[PDB]
Design a protein around this ligand. Structure first.
Ligand code: NA
Ligand code: NA
Ligand code: NA
Ligand code: NA
Lengths: 214, 214, 205, 205, 205, 205, 212, 212
């Protein structure tokens, strides 16, 4: 119903290590939430892409294969996530604290009017009791990292905004498959229906090189 | 109908120089487009704010005054622009290539699925003929700056995506008022209807300091 | 009774080289002092951590393992070393002159009323005769370094204040194990005990 | 009484701008707390230093003046603040988040068992109620700042530990005197007695 | 016939100080050479630019004013100086050793078959006797600088290749006007003529 | 014929990785153009340098070997490429976007009246039709890269100026030999004749 | 017979602000040492250099005027100080902690087998008890500055090695003249007797460009 | 009577790779100069140091073993080289362009009034015609490296000043022994006769902490 998504970053046809680390962590979290683990991958020429991803315990892999999706540019990838997340209503989204993450994260979260904790150092599942309105939020994503000038390790929660989004650096989480034969549904979408066109033209105007008139 | 907006950055109750420079440039451009010059300002305690802004030739100033709008945070300011621009459908938006600009620009443009040229060095009004589909786009914003490793000064256009957005560094454009008595409509909006709530809580979890069990 | 401690810095699960270089130097000094070498580690997931440390000749290894002890943050790691050191009363504490050493060292030495000496180039054991107090101090930690620049070299001692605390840069000291089978007690402390003294509360805005 | 101290950082005889902004900010907090504003300065040749400090509304200025107090070094300045704060028992201490501040703040707060919050963006006075214990803490120093990066902001409090210590960057707070003829006590302390504590001897070997 | 040129660097409408320092040095050299001082400026909105330049003793000022000549970009400014210098045949061209000088200088000197000498510390006029060619070269630009490091100093000359090109760092040469009323011809060139030789086309992807 | 040259940058006797990636990329472009792949290397002690270059599918390797060609200096290396390219009239020249590349690329492209496009992210072969002139330009070097920053990408072409010159950063292109037994001519040029052009004399005064 | 020297750094005919500050401080020190203040200046076109120097209370000004002494280069200035200092046997030499000071100081001290404390922060006169052999050294230059990683303000002394040398950054000491009418012996030295020749030549070897 | 010296830098009992490279290059040069190769080593615990040095073809190895020579500090190592070089009168001295080289080189050259070319890139033997007075200097050390802002590969020579000194970075020359059985005079010098005393003492003055 409301699942956990991981954005899988693609470099030269290969899914990044940090992404696999987050598939692994996503699996653990998904186990605890009793929900599904879904992945998104966007690039060009992704026929046997499931094979780097499904073994990690991915229930549903969303594939956006089109010639202008690689290399990464902000608008295409952003609109894909924003649109997909509008339909799927993920409760959680994780991605690598990479150069792409540092770009894609802020845009997608802003567009979905959601939270984002960057460079999380641990991810747990936990509750939060709001004494003020007297309610208990259950099964929130605990976004854990050093805080306040590195004085303590604090936890951040987004009680209401979805998705709860977080990034993690490479090497923080271990990667580990479930089974090389893990079975998962692969969905190859029509990029047209998800991606947003370019609409920019680079010109060099002639009059910019004509001597200024008196 | 479709006007030119300038986001006015606020620091300690004062509108930034780069913002005034862009009000001035916006005026010139608006003159050429025969459209209105509108401004947006968001902060706290903005009673006599029109007085730093209207003299520059601003037809319509939009004021968002609420206690959590200053200092700047990305989500509030972003949602304000995104929502206001959804109603007003500006053809153009300019803002300062500041720290705030470098944050706000990308979010707002991504959310409106629009263009953005940062650090424009000149702004003109011009046309673009698309030989391919055989059409002529008239009165586009020419976004001019050094390009391709600083080899030449090129012009960028967004033939279809709106708003056409651009940022400019401080000191690039001159500032100059129209008349100290310039008359413009001041609109004080209900922030509630435009701004997006916080929904994040910073915690320090007790169990994070309890010795790990064997 | 009063031993030599070494703070073992941890990154991505691995005890840093400077720390291991100081365990080796510590072992040498401890031998000369006829005392034991103790060590401290704080981190998350340290079930097997003893394996990286004990072979260097550590007689006692104090292990603090909690979710919020990694990565390093100033307040928990400072409480731990201060509370632990008040209990154990070490005569000496060594620490790698790192980004972490540079933050933790002054905090810990200040809380225990001792003057840290950063970036030593030698450490020896020696005596100091203090004619003002009339007495002769035996078995002090000579903390040796250049005064400034590099040619003028001096020896700092703390005749009375404890622990004698110093840092050393990576690669100054040789690292070398004692034996892969080195034996030392490994204590896994209760963490809350050692950090809840800290008065640091977060409120909503 | 339990007053609010501010460390006035010195350079080439001129109290730094950060400190003046903090004497200003301090004054308002002191007004709201109904306590006094005290200030500390340490250096050399400070015959009329009060001229730069008192006008900001300082009720009591503690002056330490010896050859060895300038330029700033870590042990003497830490000794002085620590010993003084042990006697005066301030409820708050403020300090400019500068090179000097980043070295002195941790050393002093650690020796006084306080948790320093660096780079605050706002300071206010407010109440924190500890529900579990059933005790309302009144007139606490709200230490406000981003948790990290910039968008997520919280307030830190220390309900029991004293002094509550914060630092602020130059230019966060505005600076503004009360009156060029503001009057307040100027104590010129005996330095050696505040510094001779530290145990740090230099040997020629 | 064959004069001394100085490239005048422009930022935010203002001729940079290094450029003005080189107009002064140029004026000195030109006087010794018994030739004229000419200068080049490329930018946007240079109606009054002559006012910043002429007083330094410039006999001729070549002005290139177009929207795309500001800020500086490698290809237009290189075409201009190359085409202009082919026409005028300067015996010398000076240029400020700046971020701009460092990009433009090698491009321009390469296109005109001369070896630029960067970062000179002196410039003089002198003779060179070349026994291989049998001849004696008179009135060459001694381009004086350290070989490397700083103690070993040498003099470069280009006996035949023109223009003799050198750069100098800001603050090496004194700047000083000749007279506020200094007179020189100001030519406003047609820009396209001097830049359309460049073959650089942008296409859509 | 009009072939495709690649400058093979040298360090401590080993052709740099960027160049090998460019010999690889060059080979494909040369295949698509149906021209030959040529390469240039300049340094000292290059007796069996062909061993590192030829396997990438180089048809002709020009070798310049003198004491003064290593380490890289600007005038000799620029002379060599410029004179050689004047004789061979290459249609394309590729070079690694490195410290050496950023100094040599502009110098060489300027002397050959070509516009260098630095830091390309892709190279392809394609047609540009000049509508206004009525001429279709065939098999041009598409020099693809971001206009600035990263999201806005265009292709630059030089429809008439030769060589069409581009640089690429290390790691953009993959490197991959054709065969360890790929055969191709290895010319060992007379250096002095390619370098003696430059007019640069050092005087002792 | 053992005086206090100050190296006066020249830039474009003008004695540097740091050098004037040290003339002043030097005056004070020489006053307390009951010795004369001497200064050294080295450059070209120094016909009236004595006018910006003597008023600070300089008893003797050694002037080295030669075409090759400006701009500063290491060997001439080092041999000048070293040679002169061998003849004069200063007890103290002070120098501005500048780009030149950082080069000149170490070269001169190494050649004279003397000490050198850079970036001093105060200078005093003081005594030192060599407790080990019970000897008291009187009236040494206390070279005072922060030490041991910014921990403490320490004092360096050189009981025996001469001269005692110290550099100081600009703006640390005040400058103050004694009187525009202060009188001093101005000695214009024969440069040939103190400086050493260049003896180096930059060459470009032809065969270095010939094919192997 | 005029030989080629090489300073062998020691770290923890081991002669540095750059120093061995220069022993090798030095061997070649001394071969072409028809002179002997000599080396200098300075440290503590050098009982068998000759074993890592002699095989490179070192005819004479001057050993300075003293408790205060390790770690490297400026004055001892400079006085050793300067004093020894005054006795031996080398025509060439070579040194690794290291942290030590960058300190030792300038101090020694300044004190000996010799040249010094840092970061040489090749070393050759060659002649120089002083065209001005028609004299030919034979068999000079060609000190070769990039010059004038990375424009040209130039060659520096010191026709008269001795020794001719040059540093070289590690990895520029190959190292290659002559024979494990190469024989050389190993001289263990009386350190007192070459080194100079410390004479400095770090103090903390009590009144510096007393109220003004
Ligand atoms: Na203690
Ligand atoms: Na307390
Ligand atoms: Na020419
Ligand atoms: Na051509």
């Amino acid at each position: 119903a409301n699942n956990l998504f991981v954005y899988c970053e693609i470099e030269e046809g290969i899914v990044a290590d940090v992404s696999l680390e987050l598939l692994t962590k996503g699996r653990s979290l998904a186990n605890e939430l009793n929900c599904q683990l879904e992945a998104v991958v966007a690039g060009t020429g992704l026929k046997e892409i499931e094979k780097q991803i499904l073994p990690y315990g991915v229930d549903k892999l969303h594939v956006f294969d089109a010639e202008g999706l690689y290399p990464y540019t902000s608008l295409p990838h952003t609109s894909i996530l924003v649109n997909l997340f509008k339909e799927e209503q993920p409760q959680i989204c994780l991605m690598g604290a990479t150069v792409i993450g540092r770009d894609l994260g802020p845009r997608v979260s802003s567009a979905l009017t959601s939270g984002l904790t960057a460079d999380c150092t641990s991810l747990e599942i936990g509750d939060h009791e709001d004494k003020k309105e007297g309610k208990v939020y259950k099964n929130l994503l605990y976004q854990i990292r050093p805080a306040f000038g590195g004085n303590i390790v604090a936890t951040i929660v987004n009680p209401e905004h979805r998705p709860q989004m977080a990034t993690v650096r490479e090497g923080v989480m271990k990667k580990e498959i479930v089974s090389p034969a893990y079975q998962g549904e692969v969905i190859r979408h029509d990029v047209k229906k998800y991606v947003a066109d370019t609409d920019y033209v680079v010109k060099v105007i002639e009059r910019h090189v004509e001597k200024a008139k008196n």
